[PDB]
Amino acid sequence: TTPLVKGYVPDDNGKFDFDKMLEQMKYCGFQATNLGLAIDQINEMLHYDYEPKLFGLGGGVEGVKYKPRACKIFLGITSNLISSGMRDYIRFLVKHALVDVVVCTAGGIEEDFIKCLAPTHMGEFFHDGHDLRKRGLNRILIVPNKNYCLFEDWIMPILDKCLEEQNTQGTKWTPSKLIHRLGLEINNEDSVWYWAAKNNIPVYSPALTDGSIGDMIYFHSYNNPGLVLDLVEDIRDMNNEPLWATKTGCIILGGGVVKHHIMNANLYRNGADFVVYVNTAHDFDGSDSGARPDEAVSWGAISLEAKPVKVYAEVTLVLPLLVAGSFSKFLAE
Amino acid sequence: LVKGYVPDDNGKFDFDKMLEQMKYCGFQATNLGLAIDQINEMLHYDYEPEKKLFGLGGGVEGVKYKPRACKIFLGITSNLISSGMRDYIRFLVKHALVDVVVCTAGGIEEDFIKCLAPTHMGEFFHDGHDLRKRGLNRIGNLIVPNKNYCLFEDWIMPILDKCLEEQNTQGTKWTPSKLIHRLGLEINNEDSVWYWAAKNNIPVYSPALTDGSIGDMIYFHSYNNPGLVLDLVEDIRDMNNEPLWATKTGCIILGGGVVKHHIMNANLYRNGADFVVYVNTAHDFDGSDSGARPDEAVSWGAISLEAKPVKVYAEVTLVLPLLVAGSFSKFLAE
Amino acid sequence: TPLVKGYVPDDFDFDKMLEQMKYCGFQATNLGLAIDQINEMLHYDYEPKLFGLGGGVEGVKYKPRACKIFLGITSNLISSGMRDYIRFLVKHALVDVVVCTAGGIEEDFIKCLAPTHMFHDGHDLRKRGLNRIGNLIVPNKNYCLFEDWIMPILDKCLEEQNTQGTKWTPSKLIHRLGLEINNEDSVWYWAAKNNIPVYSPALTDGSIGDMIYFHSYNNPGLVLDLVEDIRDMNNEPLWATKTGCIILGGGVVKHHIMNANLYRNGADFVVYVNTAHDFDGSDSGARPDEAVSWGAISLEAKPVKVYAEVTLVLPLLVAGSFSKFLAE
Amino acid sequence: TPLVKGYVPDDNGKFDFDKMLEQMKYCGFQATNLGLAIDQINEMLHYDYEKLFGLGGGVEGVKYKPRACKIFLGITSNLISSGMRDYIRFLVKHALVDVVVCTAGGIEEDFIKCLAPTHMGEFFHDGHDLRKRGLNRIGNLIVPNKNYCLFEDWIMPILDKCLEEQNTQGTKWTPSKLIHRLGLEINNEDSVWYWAAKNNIPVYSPALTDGSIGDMIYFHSYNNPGLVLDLVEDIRDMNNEPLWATKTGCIILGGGVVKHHIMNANLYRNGADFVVYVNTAHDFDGSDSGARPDEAVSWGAISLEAKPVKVYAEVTLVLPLLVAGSFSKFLAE
Amino acid sequence: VNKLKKGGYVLIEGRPCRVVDITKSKTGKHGHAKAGIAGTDLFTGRRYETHLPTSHEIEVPFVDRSDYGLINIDDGHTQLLTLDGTLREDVDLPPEGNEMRQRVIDLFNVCVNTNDQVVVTVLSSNGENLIVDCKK
Numbered sequence A: 001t002t003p004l005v006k007g008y009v010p011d012d013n014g015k016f017d018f019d020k021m022l023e024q025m026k027y028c029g030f031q032a033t034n035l036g037l038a039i040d041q042i043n044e045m046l047h048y049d050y051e052p053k054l055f056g057l058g059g060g061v062e063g064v065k066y067k068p069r070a071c072k073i074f075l076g077i078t079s080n081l082i083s084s085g086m087r088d089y090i091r092f093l094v095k096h097a098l099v100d101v102v103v104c105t106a107g108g109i110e111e112d113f114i115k116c117l118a119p120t121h122m123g124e125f126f127h128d129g130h131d132l133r134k135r136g137l138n139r140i141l142i143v144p145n146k147n148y149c150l151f152e153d154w155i156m157p158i159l160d161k162c163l164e165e166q167n168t169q170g171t172k173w174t175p176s177k178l179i180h181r182l183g184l185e186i187n188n189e190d191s192v193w194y195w196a197a198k199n200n201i202p203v204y205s206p207a208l209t210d211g212s213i214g215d216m217i218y219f220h221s222y223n224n225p226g227l228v229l230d231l232v233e234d235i236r237d238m239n240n241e242p243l244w245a246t247k248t249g250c251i252i253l254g255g256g257v258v259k260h261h262i263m264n265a266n267l268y269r270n271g272a273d274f275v276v277y278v279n280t281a282h283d284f285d286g287s288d289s290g291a292r293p294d295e296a297v298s299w300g301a302i303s304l305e306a307k308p309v310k311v312y313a314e315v316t317l318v319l320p321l322l323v324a325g326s327f328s329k330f331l332a333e
Numbered sequence B: 001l002v003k004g005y006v007p008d009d010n011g012k013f014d015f016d017k018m019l020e021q022m023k024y025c026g027f028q029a030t031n032l033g034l035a036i037d038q039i040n041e042m043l044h045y046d047y048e049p050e051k052k053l054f055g056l057g058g059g060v061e062g063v064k065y066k067p068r069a070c071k072i073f074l075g076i077t078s079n080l081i082s083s084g085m086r087d088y089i090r091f092l093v094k095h096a097l098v099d100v101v102v103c104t105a106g107g108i109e110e111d112f113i114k115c116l117a118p119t120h121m122g123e124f125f126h127d128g129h130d131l132r133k134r135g136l137n138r139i140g141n142l143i144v145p146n147k148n149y150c151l152f153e154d155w156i157m158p159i160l161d162k163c164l165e166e167q168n169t170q171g172t173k174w175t176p177s178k179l180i181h182r183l184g185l186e187i188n189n190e191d192s193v194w195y196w197a198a199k200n201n202i203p204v205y206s207p208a209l210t211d212g213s214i215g216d217m218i219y220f221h222s223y224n225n226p227g228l229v230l231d232l233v234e235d236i237r238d239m240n241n242e243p244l245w246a247t248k249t250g251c252i253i254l255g256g257g258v259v260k261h262h263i264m265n266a267n268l269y270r271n272g273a274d275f276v277v278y279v280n281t282a283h284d285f286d287g288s289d290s291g292a293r294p295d296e297a298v299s300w301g302a303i304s305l306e307a308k309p310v311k312v313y314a315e316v317t318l319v320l321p322l323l324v325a326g327s328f329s330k331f332l333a334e
Numbered sequence C: 001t002p003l004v005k006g007y008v009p010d011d012f013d014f015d016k017m018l019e020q021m022k023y024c025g026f027q028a029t030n031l032g033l034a035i036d037q038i039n040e041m042l043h044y045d046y047e048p049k050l051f052g053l054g055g056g057v058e059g060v061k062y063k064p065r066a067c068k069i070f071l072g073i074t075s076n077l078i079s080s081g082m083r084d085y086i087r088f089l090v091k092h093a094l095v096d097v098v099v100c101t102a103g104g105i106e107e108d109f110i111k112c113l114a115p116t117h118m119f120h121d122g123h124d125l126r127k128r129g130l131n132r133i134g135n136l137i138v139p140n141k142n143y144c145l146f147e148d149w150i151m152p153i154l155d156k157c158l159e160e161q162n163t164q165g166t167k168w169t170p171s172k173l174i175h176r177l178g179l180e181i182n183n184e185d186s187v188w189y190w191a192a193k194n195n196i197p198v199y200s201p202a203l204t205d206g207s208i209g210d211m212i213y214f215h216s217y218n219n220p221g222l223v224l225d226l227v228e229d230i231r232d233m234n235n236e237p238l239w240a241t242k243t244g245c246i247i248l249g250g251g252v253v254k255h256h257i258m259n260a261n262l263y264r265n266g267a268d269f270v271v272y273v274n275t276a277h278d279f280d281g282s283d284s285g286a287r288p289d290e291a292v293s294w295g296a297i298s299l300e301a302k303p304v305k306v307y308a309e310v311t312l313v314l315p316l317l318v319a320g321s322f323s324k325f326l327a328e
Numbered sequence D: 001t002p003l004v005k006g007y008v009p010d011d012n013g014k015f016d017f018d019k020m021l022e023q024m025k026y027c028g029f030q031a032t033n034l035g036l037a038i039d040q041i042n043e044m045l046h047y048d049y050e051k052l053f054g055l056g057g058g059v060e061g062v063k064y065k066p067r068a069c070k071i072f073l074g075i076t077s078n079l080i081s082s083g084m085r086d087y088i089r090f091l092v093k094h095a096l097v098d099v100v101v102c103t104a105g106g107i108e109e110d111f112i113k114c115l116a117p118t119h120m121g122e123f124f125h126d127g128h129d130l131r132k133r134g135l136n137r138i139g140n141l142i143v144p145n146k147n148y149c150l151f152e153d154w155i156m157p158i159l160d161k162c163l164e165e166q167n168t169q170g171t172k173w174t175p176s177k178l179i180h181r182l183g184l185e186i187n188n189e190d191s192v193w194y195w196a197a198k199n200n201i202p203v204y205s206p207a208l209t210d211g212s213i214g215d216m217i218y219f220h221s222y223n224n225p226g227l228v229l230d231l232v233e234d235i236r237d238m239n240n241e242p243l244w245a246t247k248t249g250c251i252i253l254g255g256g257v258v259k260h261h262i263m264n265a266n267l268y269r270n271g272a273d274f275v276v277y278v279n280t281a282h283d284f285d286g287s288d289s290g291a292r293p294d295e296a297v298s299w300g301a302i303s304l305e306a307k308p309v310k311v312y313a314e315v316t317l318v319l320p321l322l323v324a325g326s327f328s329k330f331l332a333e
Numbered sequence E: 001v002n003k004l005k006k007g008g009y010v011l012i013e014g015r016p017c018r019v020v021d022i023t024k025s026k027t028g029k030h031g032h033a034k035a036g037i038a039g040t041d042l043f044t045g046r047r048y049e050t051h052l053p054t055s056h057e058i059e060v061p062f063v064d065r066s067d068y069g070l071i072n073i074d075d076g077h078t079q080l081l082t083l084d085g086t087l088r089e090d091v092d093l094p095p096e097g098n099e100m101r102q103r104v105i106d107l108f109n110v111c112v113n114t115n116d117q118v119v120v121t122v123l124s125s126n127g128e129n130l131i132v133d134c135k136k
């Protein structure tokens, strides 16, 4: 008495209905069943409400529409998603304050600010590593060497004012606080970080030193000594983020420290209510990145009530449909 | 230039616009946009120097057909016909946009079984012992029931007896492809991909036809009525001869295995395929043919050196709907 | 629940490390448990059907087993240096039957005429007349050497079919070829001398099939009948009490042995070594539980899969199990 | 243009395990890499040129080895939970490994194993069932619940003492310094960290808060406020570690934060010299974990002269042969 | 903490706090079993966070709501008539920003030459007390 496999047949006339393909992705089978179930989990998150905290209130910027939600949404993004064309589908999620908190790796924090400062070039996976070094081109998708130098000119002043403020006004800086101040400083509507500063969305990176930001902190300390970043205050803030909400949902795209920090934080909450994982990793090696949603339920990161969905696919293919079949419909609605 | 489509602030999303920029999103999405490009070139290859046109079709009334100068081969692994991608495949055969299909024994058996009864959906992590205890068979997250395979036995056994009778009296020599052309003509359900291939004279070749449900049936029939002979020698001459006349060759391999090799070996005769799109989930580090990159295939002269091969590393269930939407549907309307 | 303790290196004994592999976790746990499954197959005796009797060749040690062993090798394995470990298994009749694709069958015969050699640009390899499989490249000259040897045997097989009415199949041709190579180096020669059947239902899918195509336009009427071969391959597992499958790789080789074991209602012992995952829905990627679902593996049996390249796992597997049997 | 020749076993029944290893480079595919890897580890040990390393702490009853080689071991949390801990303990006891770089979970596991051991399992168990029975899962290895309470009781007094020194003697704590103190405190020969503390082997985990130790730091902060962990001082120490060496050799078993931290640090000397990566990952996703040594060459992390070797396998299978073919020969030598 | 229902009282950091939040964890990697209790100070309206184990108890502060007749505004302490009939000048008007302060005075004034008296409310926790409501 279970559902029947059935694809949507293409139109004889030739005007394909992309809307009808999206609806029938769930019944195709294999990884398409996952994409359809992934759309369903996010739809439950955006349209959640109860009769007694409101989230997605936003910062009340004019000319922008926000809709209130009873669900808190944590988005885990690896550096790849803030380096690929998935930035346009994440800026939209932050601008309308559809995501309450973001946790990102340090290269991703550095990429948004460099992207707003300068553009990214296209390239191939099979490119000679030795040659790319001679041309000073990094690889991930080519982000040029000159790009980081423009970023260095921007970040160094904010830290110097942070050092001046720390000694004079007793401001104890942490990694999250540097990013929120850095996002306010960019003042570019292109940035996902500017919108989080305007809409009061906290961004947390536990290894902020691992990345371009950490090298700039290192050079500044020799020139201006004594800057201190306290992880103890940051772990106090991050762990408390899930405790407040009636329900919390985790859209972790990619794997790594970001998968673990959001899942670890949800332990204090007894487990995340809803979750979607999109990555290209397998559980055979015993790694955390490839660990299936089942392993996360083992240590209490996922609520036993939840029905976690993992799409075993590159995010660049799965997310564009995921925004189309969930967030776009609710905001316009 | 790396780029993306911003879903509109008023929630206006053009799915067409999402598909149009895929090429510029980066990573695997670039490969999906590039894949749509080569498949479109195959449909639009019609050119001018008699002239050889492919896709003329069965001539059946009430169905649109369009003539093309380029000859297109489709490699389908058995899982794809079990998957909902069968409906997208039926569209190519019905309009005869694909000239020849190379499909393994399991896929051939499934299209005829699908007409007889439907395949059920499920989860990858289900007990294998329990599934067997419930008399269910599993192909990934799909569950073809035990009763369904018996239905294929009832239909195929009479056609095979007629095949033996023709060999004894009219001296017919039966090869795997000929057996499927007769089977497709006799399905009598418009649902079958093979029914359309039979109607539009599309040759379907499985090298290991015994390696599947059809082979257990062939074996079981032999003991009751001995004498059937299936000659690979005739099939190898026909299948290798296929690529010669075509002005250009369009190789679309979805999956990997004997099917990737069978079509790829055949393309060596004319010195290589001219347009190739491979969608699969395998890596070359193990030296396998299945995971072999397009470059390994270029090494033995299976792909034209001139051709720009495209490999999308993804489950086909997610890449083919965009590939059909962005290429064949528009051309038929054009 | 057993503990996790790795071998403590002495402030090295490779044999002692192999004993603690079952206890080092992850894929090492499986390589250790896999060695155990191979050991169980060799040391199983049930009083009532002996197998591995051998060809009686003088100077060669052979041991009786109440166990029938099916070894499925993808073509890449015969191509690599794993050929020597596979040859050792057939010389001592440890493996009763072999299922291999036209590339492995062609490879053993071609290496005897000319040897295999050890990121390379694919276009450049065609320009140099080189065929690339992994990091192993087979020269284009090697294929011509196979052509000279196979053509006369094919002409003789047609002549026998025309006059003595012998009906040929893919397995028969491989045994005839093993008799012609007459080289103990060949895996197939020791299989033939020891009366070990080798099956390949897509034999036309490879160099042997391409060679058949060229032969037909010169000497027509040769028939390679699949109907007879399927009856022999499916009937191989029925007579014994126990059957063991060591499938190195996945595909036609995996499906043909497993499907045959359905006729005995399941294969008693199995070890799978392939770098493949179940997400794609593919037959190769399927873990043992999908194979159990059809009924190919006995429900009672405990299957083992090592998610690793065979090139790393098998040298330890022969060392950890078969070498002990010959020593015994 | 060498031949592909495998070892042929002896007819009598004797199999030389040494002779199997001699032909690995000549057996093809990943065996070729495992044999080629053994060569690079051998090159590191026998690279003595006219800068003192591997001297050790001079502990009695322990064999020690020569200088001219800094070795950085990029271990992940999974390996320490596995029985590869025995191989790592032997490697650091003899000081061939000059530096430890590992994630927070490996740091926590070594100590908990001292207090209590790990259990086996398998990859197929309802994650819900395991958690009901109070058992965490890491691949097929189960680390029991009690093992985390023993760690808390051991580290809590040490953290209070660390705060007292900052409050009274002004000691500025950073993540590496806390681990060295915990290494001395355990005073247990079984621990890999104890030997590093005795042999002055620095342990550098950049995101220490992402694990049990960080969760433990948070619960202490409420009862005893004001504990501060700085990343600014840690990045100065970790980044400068490659600079002081005749040559630098990386053995990154695994991927992620540990791969980037060792490689990024080696960018300081314009690129590391000898490297062996053993990780189950590929470059299609563009992830840091799956990157080929070639992408690392594009950043400048690997020296152009360096021959990077990556074995696309699981460390749990590659490592036992790897010590056998390289380090064991040197100690006896 | 086994009886710590929300809506009851606790002393957190020395400020009487009304429980408005509490989470309990069975056990886990985090460490041994812990519990986060949260409460808002009555005087400053500020929520605070604490983390503790089980099998323990937390200070509870005796707070009693108290109405007294407003007799005079003694320049910030106010004459207040107790139900007993004793006179207390200890209570001072609510501080600045607290709109209660304007609502006490404006209602004393509406009432001073009239026959209606103001009733104030001064919630009292030990020595601590503040006019939290007023009424004619």
Ligand SMILES: NC(=O)c1ccc[n+]([C@@H]2O[C@H](COP(=O)([O-])OP(=O)(O)OC[C@H]3O[C@@H](n4cnc5c(N)ncnc54)[C@H](O)[C@@H]3O)[C@@H](O)[C@H]2O)c1
Residues within 6 Å of the ligand: A078, A079, A080, A081, A083, A105, A106, A107, A108, A140, A207, A210, A211, A253, A254, A255, A256, A257, A258, A278, A279, A280, A281, A289, A290, A313, A314, A315, A316, D255, D256, D257, D260, D281, D285, D286, D287, D288, D289, D290
């Ligand atoms: N581009 C980069 O990855 C990048 C850039 C700068 C620095 N770094 C540093 O590398 C370290 C580790 O990075 P991480 O924690 O983001 O992990 P990672 O980038 O190594 O990714 C780990 C896993 O995430 C998954 N994944 C990542 N990108 C994916 C994609 N596009 N599609 C599908 N799956 C994907 C894969 O399963 C992969 O194995 C951090 O310290 C980070 O600051 C990374």
Ligand SMILES: NC(=O)c1ccc[n+]([C@@H]2O[C@H](COP(=O)([O-])OP(=O)(O)OC[C@H]3O[C@@H](n4cnc5c(N)ncnc54)[C@H](O)[C@@H]3O)[C@@H](O)[C@H]2O)c1
Residues within 6 Å of the ligand: B077, B078, B079, B080, B082, B104, B105, B106, B107, B139, B208, B211, B212, B213, B254, B255, B256, B257, B258, B259, B279, B280, B281, B282, B290, B291, B314, B315, B316, B317, C250, C251, C252, C255, C276, C280, C281, C282, C283, C284, C285
């Ligand atoms: N459903 C079945 O696969 C099935 C059913 C019955 C019989 N058989 C028999 O099994 C034998 C081997 O089957 P095969 O040759 O089709 O190979 P296969 O199905 O085992 O697939 C081989 C490889 O193709 C690729 N692949 C498969 N499915 C894919 C997908 N959905 N998306 C992307 N890549 C994919 C992967 O690289 C995979 O490892 C044949 O003789 C066949 O008749 C299989």
Ligand SMILES: NC(=O)c1ccc[n+]([C@@H]2O[C@H](COP(=O)([O-])OP(=O)(O)OC[C@H]3O[C@@H](n4cnc5c(N)ncnc54)[C@H](O)[C@@H]3O)[C@@H](O)[C@H]2O)c1
Residues within 6 Å of the ligand: B256, B257, B258, B261, B282, B286, B287, B288, B289, B290, B291, C073, C074, C075, C076, C077, C079, C101, C102, C103, C104, C133, C202, C205, C206, C248, C249, C250, C251, C252, C253, C273, C274, C275, C276, C284, C308, C309, C310, C311
């Ligand atoms: N050497 C060759 O690859 C070669 C040569 C000539 C012809 N062919 C033809 O190619 C067709 C398909 O080849 P196939 O069915 O033998 O296998 P395959 O290429 O379909 O392999 C299927 C899967 O098996 C696994 N695998 C293969 N070799 C492995 C190894 N050494 N270690 C670990 N895992 C391994 C991988 O997961 C791979 O994706 C056959 O019909 C064959 O005749 C191949």
Ligand SMILES: NC(=O)c1ccc[n+]([C@@H]2O[C@H](COP(=O)([O-])OP(=O)(O)OC[C@H]3O[C@@H](n4cnc5c(N)ncnc54)[C@H](O)[C@@H]3O)[C@@H](O)[C@H]2O)c1
Residues within 6 Å of the ligand: A255, A256, A257, A260, A281, A285, A286, A287, A288, A289, A290, C026, D076, D077, D078, D079, D081, D103, D104, D105, D106, D138, D207, D210, D211, D212, D253, D254, D255, D256, D278, D279, D280, D281, D289, D290, D313, D314, D315, D316
């Ligand atoms: N045991 C744990 O995994 C564990 C425990 C507690 C905390 N954490 C936290 O998880 C985060 C990342 O987890 P991680 O450090 O385990 O890295 P990870 O799980 O991200 O590993 C990244 C990659 O390393 C490779 N890899 C991992 N294990 C391997 C193995 N056994 N053999 C071969 N390749 C292997 C794979 O490419 C994998 O995708 C860190 O912040 C860490 O503190 C992990």
